[PDB]
Amino acid sequence: FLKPRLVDIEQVSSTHAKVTLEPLERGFGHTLGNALRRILLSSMPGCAVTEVEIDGVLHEYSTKEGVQEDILEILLNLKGLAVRVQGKDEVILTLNKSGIGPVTAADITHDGDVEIVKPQHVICHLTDENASISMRIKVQRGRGYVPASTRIRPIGRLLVDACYSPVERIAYNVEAARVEQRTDLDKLVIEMETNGTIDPEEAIRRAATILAEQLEAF
Amino acid sequence: GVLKIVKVYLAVKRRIQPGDKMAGRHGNKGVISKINPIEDMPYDENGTPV
């Protein structure tokens, strides 16, 4: 039996990329591809917004004089925020913005150990000449989908559903490989599509580590 | 016979879950029996789940 190795990682876009595993024995391409696809889609670790504290906002079913969107829509836009905190596993970003215009993710005064990977991501639009938002966005690291209705306090802190899963779409193909004198050897192309807050190489390494650790039962 | 009335408005969010009816516009109603994980749903050649 041969063994597969990561021979190429074609980072085509900022989010979606392709990794390649080669050589693979016949009948192993599908096995490894589907096991890795299921593990990537299910069990990858990421960072997600979990709690938000806007200044003069009590509940999510209200509005703020100056912004064009309800607090619910702001919470949804924050739920769709991609962030790559590096050293910690819980951080609090502070967004301060005033004046007419969009409030992109670049308007977050992010720390050293925080990386916002999509600075153009709009959050809400300020439509008044003197209207300012000052919000505290609590980003923490987790796994899978943990809704706010299952976790576990003041009347200011709003809870958003957290989707800690960097990968959005995983596909895989198996095709004949180029070996000098050998046939019936496959090659696995895993075309993944993250949101940018994870590396494809470390994603594959984490998936394989999880699979091997599960197999370590016997 | 009354002095004052106080009305309190609770707002709840109802998420979809196994049990409640979903329908189409062509008389095809049904009751959700399972919320299947993303990796368990069928997918096409581009990997997009259903």
UniProtKB/Swiss-Prot annotation, chain A:
Keyword Methyltransferase annotated: no
GO CC annotations, alphabetized: cytoplasm; DNA-directed RNA polymerase complex
Quaternary structure annotation from Swiss-Prot or TrEMBL: Homodimer. The RNAP catalytic core consists of 2 alpha, 1 beta, 1 beta' and 1 omega subunit. When a sigma factor is associated with the core the holoenzyme is formed, which can initiate transcription.
Function: DNA-dependent RNA polymerase catalyzes the transcription of DNA into RNA using the four ribonucleoside triphosphates as substrates.
GO biological process, one term: DNA-templated transcription
Region Alpha N-terminal domain (alpha-NTD): start-end pairs: 1-218
Source organism per UniProt: Escherichia coli O157:H7
Keyword field: DNA-directed RNA polymerase, Nucleotidyltransferase, Transcription, Transferase
EC number per UniProt: 2.7.7.6
Gene Ontology terms for molecular function: DNA binding; DNA-directed RNA polymerase activity; protein dimerization activity
Phylogenetic classification of the source organism: Bacteria, Pseudomonadati, Pseudomonadota, Gammaproteobacteria, Enterobacterales
The protein's enzyme class: transferase
Domain notes: The N-terminal domain is essential for RNAP assembly and basal transcription, whereas the C-terminal domain is involved in interaction with transcriptional regulators and with upstream promoter elements.
Reaction equation(s) it catalyzes: RNA(n) + a ribonucleoside 5'-triphosphate = RNA(n+1) + diphosphate
Membership in a protein family: Belongs to the RNA polymerase alpha chain family.
UniProt-recorded name of the protein: DNA-directed RNA polymerase subunit alpha
Domain of life: Bacteria
From Swiss-Prot, chain B:
Top-level division of the source organism's lineage: Bacteria
Family: Belongs to the RNA polymerase beta chain family.
Subunit structure: The RNAP catalytic core consists of 2 alpha, 1 beta, 1 beta' and 1 omega subunit. When a sigma factor is associated with the core the holoenzyme is formed, which can initiate transcription.
Annotated function: DNA-dependent RNA polymerase catalyzes the transcription of DNA into RNA using the four ribonucleoside triphosphates as substrates.
Protein name, per record: DNA-directed RNA polymerase subunit beta
Annotated organism of origin: Escherichia coli O157:H7
Portion held of the full protein: 1045 to 1094 of 1342
